[PDB]
């Protein structure tokens, strides 16, 4: 008989999917534990499968030359995954910013809002009622991303001719799209599912452009 021990430390990238109950690792082995599970900020309410004795958390942890922060370690029956703990709500979101339209016209016709974007040639249809952000699960980052994008765009382009009007307005359009909208004035809980193609919206915009033109002329 002959044994062998090779202590191996590998910096892999883990991945988790909604509802972030467990995360996979680059080595193809699951860890059945929420990435945000911990003790602070009421993180104990997160779902975990391993018993509490196999999980420990360290506050004020500094790495190795191989700004101390918190550390969230674990001992799976095969390995010991370790990742620095982060607050779930600002750490993860269930909606990704798709496009930043500099000028997206909003119009009301037939009891709906027709957000037409001539820049990307795409028209969405949404209800008049503003979609509440509370209805979106883990959607706090949506507000931050939208505000940053609109502030950047306004400073770059619109600060000389137009002004903003109030807080941004959020509407949910057909196909599973959330349109964070900020109206401008010239100086003169559930998870939403999104379609896999914007072909319907592009065709709607093209048909609307052609139809308005031919109808007017």
């Amino acid at each position: 008989y002959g044994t062998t021990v090779n202590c191996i430390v590998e910096e892999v990238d883990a991945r988790s999917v909604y509802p972030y109950d467990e995360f996979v690792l680059a080595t193809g082995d699951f860890v059945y534990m929420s990435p945000f599970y911990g003790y602070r900020e009421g993180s104990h309410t997160e779902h975990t499968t391993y018993a509490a004795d196999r999980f420990k958390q360290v506050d004020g942890f500094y790495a190795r030359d191989l700004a101390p922060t918190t550390r969230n370690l674990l001992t799976t029956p095969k390995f010991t995954v370790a990742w620095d703990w982060v607050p779930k709500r600002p750490s993860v979101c269930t909606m990704t910013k798709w496009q930043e339209v500099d000028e997206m016209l909003r119009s009301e016709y037939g009891g709906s809002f027709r957000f037409s974007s001539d820049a990307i040639s795409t028209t969405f249809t949404t209800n008049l009622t503003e979609y509440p952000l509370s209805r979106v699960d883990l959607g706090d980052c949506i507000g931050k991303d939208a505000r940053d994008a609109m502030d950047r765009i306004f400073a770059r382009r619109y600060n000389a001719t137009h002004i903003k009007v109030g807080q941004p307005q959020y509407y949910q359009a057909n196909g599973g799209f959330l349109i964070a909208y900020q109206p401008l004035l010239s100086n003169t809980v559930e998870r939403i599912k999104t379609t896999s193609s914007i072909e319907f919206a592009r065709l709607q915009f093209t048909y609307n452009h052609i139809q308005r033109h031919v109808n007017d002329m």
Partner: antibody
Amino acid sequence: EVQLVETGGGVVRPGRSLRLSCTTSGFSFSGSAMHWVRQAPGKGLEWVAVISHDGNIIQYHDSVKGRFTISRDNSKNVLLLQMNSLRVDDTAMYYCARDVWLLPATISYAFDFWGQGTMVTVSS
Amino acid sequence: VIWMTQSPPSLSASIGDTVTITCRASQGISNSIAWYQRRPGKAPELLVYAAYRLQSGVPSRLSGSGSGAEYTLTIKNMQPEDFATYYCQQYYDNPLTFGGGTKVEIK
């Protein structure tokens, strides 16, 4: 001419609720939003509540979570502010501030015309 | 919560003088500030919104400026009807907050 006549203010011992109402003469409901702003003695102004043109959009100040209620009736042009469990810090000059009109249906969070004021105090 | 710092708390200027008042923010609000004044014994009236827009009836001498987290209301050649308290109010986020207030009493 726009006139914000508001009543329902008076001395109330701490512990229970109170009701405030406002009447609009020139300002037309269902066309503009309405706010409630209070001004405690010795301090500056403080935003409390806002109601949309129709009433489907309600936003409250962080200090009136679960304690204040706002409503409007566009038929009689009367704005209702109902507060529950008013504390001593709520002593303030409550004005029925009107949100400025910039677009047909938008709440601008800026007050173009204010009410005269009303005495709302919580003493024991 | 966005914190308003309308400094200085008080000033003094005579008729025809120029005066400036400064409002600071805990974070950038992107021109989403409003300036309010109250004549003694009078209800507040809107003066500036979007930080550089003046409504109908506002004297052209009044003017707002600044960007980001810095916004200053400048009054040039102040008349008798311009000496009153001034309040800077933001509306970028929630809850809405007002400024501390500045006073301009004639010497």
